[PDB]
């Protein structure tokens, strides 16, 4: 549960930056490079004091053995675009009722965690 | 020496503004200054649109309150101290009167 | 110039004030009393004066109690 040539058959650039190079990159470069919505998240949001969770993201990745996914990293926030150091964590994403644990991969880079967690039904009416 | 002093008058009560502007123009000529006259700046209509019905089920009843303030200036080619001396005294209520060193 | 009062104790008005608040003459003062028969101690009335020689006493003879009332000489 980690970086490139693994959890990626969807290859080259997600928005303008190749995920193959991106996992060798830092995300301080990725906000500069072809990631405008992520740029507005990483420059204006600017590392938004979820550091204890960000520590826990790097704690549970460290505490679990690296051939396996982390144990649990729950967040309340769902506005998180997956960073190359984030890739691999099984991130509990809260939708205001329930935590949704998502392993985050080279393909999912550029996508918010509220894009894999849902707050909404595929609407039924008896349907 | 003379000193062209603006006397700016702001009020919302016109006849209160008129009875004080009559005092300023005459009293400047009663004890001699420039007398120039009422430079009628236009009124400002402060219009605010409000709801007449709170918890507004039923009919959309709109209510508008207007408040009209009234500006004018009186530039006086007259000696600086006794422009503001004769004018600014004896008028406390109702009307803002702004004597002004500028337009020198 | 009048010194409006909410009470005015025993030297009330109507030749009780013609020698007390001042020495100079007044026109006429209304009081709710009928100031000859009852000798009733009551204040809800007023005090009219001419304000020539009246201002010097009553602003140090306000806030006081001739009986158990409280003279508010507020001039207007």
């Amino acid at each position: 549960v980690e970086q490139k040539k693994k959890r990626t058959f969807r290859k080259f650039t997600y928005r303008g930056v190749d995920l193959d190079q991106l996992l060798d990159m830092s995300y301080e470069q990725l906000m500069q490079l072809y990631s405008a919505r992520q740029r507005r998240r990483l420059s204006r949001g600017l590392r938004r004091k979820q550091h204890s969770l960000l520590k826990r993201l790097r704690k549970a990745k460290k505490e679990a053995p690296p051939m396996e996914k982390p144990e649990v990293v729950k967040t309340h926030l769902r506005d998180m675009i997956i960073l190359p150091e984030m890739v691999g964590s099984m991130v509990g994403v809260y939708n205001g009722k329930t935590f949704n644990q998502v392993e985050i991969k080279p393909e999912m880079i550029g996508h918010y965690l509220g894009e894999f967690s849902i707050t909404y039904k595929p609407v039924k009416h008896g349907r | 020496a003379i000193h062209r002093i603006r006397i700016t008058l702001t009020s919302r009560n016109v006849k209160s503004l008129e009875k004080v502007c009559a005092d300023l123009i005459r009293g400047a000529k009663e004890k001699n200054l420039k007398v120039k006259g009422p430079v009628r700046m236009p009124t400002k209509t402060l219009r605010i649109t409000t709801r007449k019905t709170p918890c507004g089920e039923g009919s959309k009843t709109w209510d508008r309150f207007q408040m009209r303030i009234h500006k004018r200036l009186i530039d006086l080619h007259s000696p600086s101290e006794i422009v503001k001396q004769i004018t600014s005294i004896s008028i406390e209520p109702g009307v803002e009167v702004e004597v002004t060193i500028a337009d020198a | 110039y009048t010194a409006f009062l909410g009470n005015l104790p025993y030297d009330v008005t109507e030749e009780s004030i013609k020698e007390f608040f001042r020495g100079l003459n007044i026109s006429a003062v209304r009081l709710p009393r009928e100031p000859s028969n009852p000798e009733r101690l009551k204040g809800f009335g007023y005090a009219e004066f001419e304000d020539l020689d009246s201002l010097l006493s009553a602003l140090s003879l306000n806030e006081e109690s001739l009986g158990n009332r409280r003279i508010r000489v507020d001039v207007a």
Binding site: - | - | S60, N62, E63, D74
Partner: protein, 98 residues
């Protein structure tokens, strides 16, 4: 309730020497006016006073999300004794002779 009779006496004496105390109510506020407990939401500026108020000694008037403690004659006598000050101080409610 925390904040003892050092911070409470900062609120206690400031009522007494003036004759009035002012404060404000909001949870996103933090500050009260008048030399207060220095960027706090609606507490010990009020709660030291509310402790004294529910014992009497003051009238906390209110208007427009704002509080107006009226120093009554008992709090004139109480914080006189509470601050162990000499029994006439003229607590700035008596200073003018009108």
């Amino acid at each position: 309730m925390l904040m003892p009779k050092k911070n409470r006496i900062a609120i206690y004496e400031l009522l007494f020497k003036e004759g009035v105390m002012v404060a404000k109510k909001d949870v996103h506020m933090p500050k009260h006016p008048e030399l207060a407990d220095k960027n706090v939401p609606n507490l010990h500026v009020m709660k030291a006073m509310q402790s004294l108020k529910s014992r009497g000694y003051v009238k906390e008037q209110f208007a427009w999300r704002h509080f107006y403690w009226y120093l009554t004659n008992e709090g004139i006598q109480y914080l006189r004794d509470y601050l162990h000050l000499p029994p006439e101080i003229v607590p700035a409610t008596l200073r003018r002779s009108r």
